[PDB]
Design a protein around this ligand. Sequence first.
Ligand code: ZN
Ligand code: ZN
Ligand code: ZN
Ligand code: ZN
Ligand code: ZN
Ligand code: ZN
Lengths: 88, 86, 90
Amino acid sequence: TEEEKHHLHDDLDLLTILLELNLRNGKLSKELVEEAKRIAEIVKEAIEKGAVEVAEKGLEVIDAAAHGKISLEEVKEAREKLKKELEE
Amino acid sequence: EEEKHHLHDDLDLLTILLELNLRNGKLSKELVEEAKRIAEIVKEAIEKGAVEVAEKGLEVIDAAAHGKISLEEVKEAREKLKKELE
Amino acid sequence: GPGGTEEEKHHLHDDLDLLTILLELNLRNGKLSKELVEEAKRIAEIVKEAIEKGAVEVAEKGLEVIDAAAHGKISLEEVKEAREKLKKEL
Ligand SMILES: [Zn+2]
Ligand SMILES: [Zn+2]
Ligand SMILES: [Zn+2]
Ligand SMILES: [Zn+2]
Ligand SMILES: [Zn+2]
Ligand SMILES: [Zn+2]
């Protein structure tokens, strides 16, 4: 299971860099990247306490966002759902 | 599928690495442009489930990003790869 | 690790590519210093050789140090210390 936490952190670093690249080249808006970066905060916390499922879903969302595949509203929705689901 | 997921991770990674090594002057624009065409072939080979084409395409991109394959060799690899997809 | 298989070596190389990028990202935005990155790159050179030679444990250790450095979590003095230890452990 340490292997999966390792993988999750690898993807978090990768997608965090992808967000910054696609912000710099103008493909994404600042608000979108800020909201995705808040999900990245949740994934980091999820990784800490072992919540693989929350972390994995958060990463899927951040990847979808970095690739312009989901909306600002969908990112805000997923963030609230993920934060609350991490609380349990 | 674990493999498709890994393939997508590597295409993200190598897309970033290619720009990094263009911007710091390590790679020529023309090499990076040819590698970016291979990355399109990988993006497709992933979507299409042609995993071996995806994996070889990423190996060529990685070699290109590290300056380990010549411009002519990248051009030839892309031809061999594009054909191998169809 | 899972042994010095081609699959593990390939994973270690992915991580090194990823951390190569992160060091530059975080040098450029001012998070990391030039001397920190230079020392981290000397660990990256040790990691490279370790990956080649199948020394997955030495490589995983250098990657963990480089990662901790890139996130601003260990001091320049710790990175230098880690580089000396890792070069010897190899
Ligand atoms: Zn992944
Ligand atoms: Zn992606
Ligand atoms: Zn890989
Ligand atoms: Zn590489
Ligand atoms: Zn890794
Ligand atoms: Zn990291």
